[PDB]
């Protein structure tokens, strides 16, 4: 997260870290046994870390649970990045209380201008590298499909949306993928891709979760 702020210990209870010997992607807990992430975050041997703040130190609120299933959307296209969503089933149910909680799926899509919360342990620099110990937060608005397509000609599908500031300086970045974009308590997006990070006229692109609600519910229920 570039241009953001320190969320504060466990203030984003649905945020999880995907670990494969180190943190490589984020994710969103939507059920005690399921996490939503990006399809490009698929890896074997994934361990989901919940209740995390400082990802480099054990603080006492963490739950480390292995992924028992990592289901990439059947139509994910690794070239166009269309349908960039993945469902991860936890080997054992996560313990929910206050520092670890699920986030609701959307009942309807969000409109341009809606302010959302984006979070993650990704790079905090637009030029250079600096990975944070604690979770970072960013408030950013969903942008119009028209502005998104103008920013990324011939690259934006109906399953993607842009969010951020065209002036640059605030954006998600490497290490944030698979993470949440929550608007009004609903998970509307998944950190997906973009041209660099926090660059002018290059807002982040996110998977449009509202288009996958029925698929998510049915897939989770059939696995």
């Amino acid at each position: 997260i570039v241009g953001g702020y320190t969320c504060g210990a466990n203030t984003v209870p649905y945020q999880v870290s995907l670990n494969s010997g180190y943190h490589f992607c984020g994710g969103s807990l939507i059920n005690s046994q399921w996490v939503v992430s990006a399809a490009h975050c698929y890896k074997s041997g994934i361990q989901v870390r919940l209740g995390e703040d400082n990802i480099n130190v054990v603080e006492g609120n963490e739950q480390f649970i292995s992924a028992s299933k990592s289901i990439v959307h059947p139509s994910y296209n690794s070239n166009t990045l269309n349908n960039d969503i993945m469902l991860i089933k936890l080997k054992s149910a996560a313990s929910l209380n206050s520092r670890v909680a699920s986030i609701s799926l959307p009942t309807s899509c969000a409109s341009a201008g809606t302010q959302c919360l984006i979070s993650g342990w990704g790079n905090t620099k637009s030029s250079g590298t600096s990975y944070p110990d604690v979770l970072k937060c960013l408030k950013a608005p969903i942008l119009s499909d028209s502005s998104c397509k103008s920013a990324y000609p011939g690259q934006i599908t109906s399953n993607m949306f842009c969010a951020g500031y065209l002036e640059g300086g605030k954006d998600s970045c490497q290490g944030d993928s698979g993470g949440p974009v929550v608007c009004s308590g609903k998970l509307q997006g998944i950190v997906s891709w973009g041209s660099g990070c926090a660059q002018k006229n290059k807002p982040g692109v996110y998977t449009k979760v509202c288009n996958y609600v029925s698929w998510i519910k049915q897939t989770i229920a059939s696995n």
Binding site: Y22, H23, F24, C25, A38, H40, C41, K43, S78, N79, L81, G122, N123, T129, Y131, S172, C173, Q174, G175, D176, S177, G178, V191, S192, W193, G194, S195, G204
Partner: protein, 58 residues
């Protein structure tokens, strides 16, 4: 030629932070770099062994 082993490492547009290896001809060794998760170029390996086998001596 164009030897893909001589191409600079490519992170790509996706936002993951996956550690991969690339052959660094300038240093004569396989080094680590951050791969974003998609649109990988060929000088991108999952292990130093894979990198050395494919690009060693480039």
């Amino acid at each position: 030629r164009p030897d893909f082993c001589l191409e600079p490492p490519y992170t790509g547009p996706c936002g993951a932070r996956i550690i991969r290896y690339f052959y660094n001809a300038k240093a004569g060794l396989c080094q680590t770099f951050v791969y974003g998760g998609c649109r990988a170029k060929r000088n991108n390996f999952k292990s130093a062994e894979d990198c050395l086998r494919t690009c060693g001596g480039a």
